[PDB]
């Protein structure tokens, strides 16, 4: 491991056969500064506060993704079609801050050790699917080249509340359901 | 399960002592194995595994590619630091400190940035060293961290507990007191 005061990825370029699909982001000290949405072709910020630190011409990401596509095809052949290994993801659920009845909060579902970078993370309120107030990070990089992804659920703490984070990944025998322990 | 093949390219910048010491390492990865790399401390592309040899030789033979990559140490790493990182490094989010019993007493230090922090427990103004257990630093993903520090309580309901927190965003340490009802 390289020792340094700070580390950034400018940027993380991911491209995979399944889909196929890619991802483009810049990270600083482990957090996502911005990303390029390859579908709408726009540089975007999951946290608008960081837009003041600089924009980005999305064409740079689009060009890199085209090169990444070319490289992947070539590497698949060089590696005799060795497929990715489905690793077992690790899931933890916790709140952003101390929970107080009636005071808005956020539940956080961390899915670590992800590979390949394909996963479905959903939220269940007393067993039923919930989509309102849900958002997530991009696949964030790790030095061992696997990824981690975090999903968020904004909610109003209430009596009798029941929450679970459901994770689907090929590395799991069956979907993983993680109950939030308040 | 569907088969998948993954390519990852990471243009990594390492900084130490401001921008006095900077190192660029671009990594080419197939699935989870890095096969080729450009290290600015080396100056040329190197094959990390046999599968990267074709590229290392090809890229080093292309003047525009090699010179362009060598220049990225400055054009990417150092200039990104000037335009964005210096400012991000000035970001300060003050932690919120809350105490509650779970015997264990838990001091929850939440929503702070950067990640450097110091949390200490005090009992009747006496710093506690034993009976203290802390969770690792927790990355929330939204540019804030949190950390929990537990303390083994004494049988005396009269003892006053204080969670002392030091952080770069604070001119003065935050201290929160707790005493049984």
């Amino acid at each position: 491991d390289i020792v340094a005061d700070h580390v950034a990825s400018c940027g993380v370029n991911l491209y995979q056969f399944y889909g196929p699909s890619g991802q483009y982001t810049h990270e600083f000290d482990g957090d996502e500064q911005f990303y390029v949405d390859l579908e709408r072709k726009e540089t975007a910020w999951r946290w608008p506060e960081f837009s003041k630190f600089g924009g980005f011409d999305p064409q740079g990401a689009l060009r890199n993704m085209a090169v990444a596509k070319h490289n992947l095809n070539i590497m698949i052949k060089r590696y005799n079609s060795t497929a990715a290994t489905n690793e077992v993801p690790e899931v933890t659920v916790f709140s952003k801050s101390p929970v107080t009845l009636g005071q808005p909060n956020t539940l956080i579902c961390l899915v670590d050790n992800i590979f390949p970078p394909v996963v479905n993370i959903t939220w269940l309120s007393n067993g039923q699917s919930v989509t309102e107030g849900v958002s997530e990070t991009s696949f964030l990089s790790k030095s061992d080249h696997s990824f981690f992804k975090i999903s968020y659920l904004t909610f109003l703490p209430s009596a009798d509340e029941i929450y679970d984070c459901k994770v689907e990944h090929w590395g799991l025998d069956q979907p993983l359901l993680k109950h939030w322990e308040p | 399960s569907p088969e998948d093949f993954v390519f990852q390219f990471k243009g990594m910048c390492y900084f130490t002592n401001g921008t006095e010491r900077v190192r660029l390492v671009t990594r080419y990865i197939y699935n989870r194995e890095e096969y080729a790399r450009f290290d600015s401390d080396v100056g040329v592309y190197r094959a990390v595994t046999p599968q990267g040899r074709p590229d290392a030789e090809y890229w080093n033979s292309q003047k525009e590619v090699l010179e362009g990559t060598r220049a990225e140490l400055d054009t990417v790493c150092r200039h990104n630091y000037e335009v964005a990182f210096r400012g991000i490094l000035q970001r300060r989010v003050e932690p919120t400190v809350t105490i509650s019993p779970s015997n264990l007493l838990v001091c929850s230090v939440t929503d702070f940035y950067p990640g450097q922090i110091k949390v200490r427990w005090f009992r009747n103004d006496q710093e506690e060293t034993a009976g203290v257990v802390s969770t690792p630093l927790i990355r929330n993903g939204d540019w804030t961290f949190q950390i929990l520090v537990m303390l083994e309580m004494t049988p005396q309901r009269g003892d006053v507990y204080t969670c002392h927190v030091e952080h770069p965003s604070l001119q003065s340490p935050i201290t929160v007191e707790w005493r049984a009802q």
């Binding site: 980005f56 740079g60 890199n64 052949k77 005799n80 | -």
Partner: peptide, 20 residues
């Protein structure tokens, strides 16, 4: 101000191996 970024190098065609 648009931020700079590293460019992914274009792989050499043909370098051994065979699709399976």
């Amino acid at each position: 101000m648009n931020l700079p970024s590293t460019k992914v190098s274009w792989a050499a065609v043909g370098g051994g191996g065979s699709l399976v």
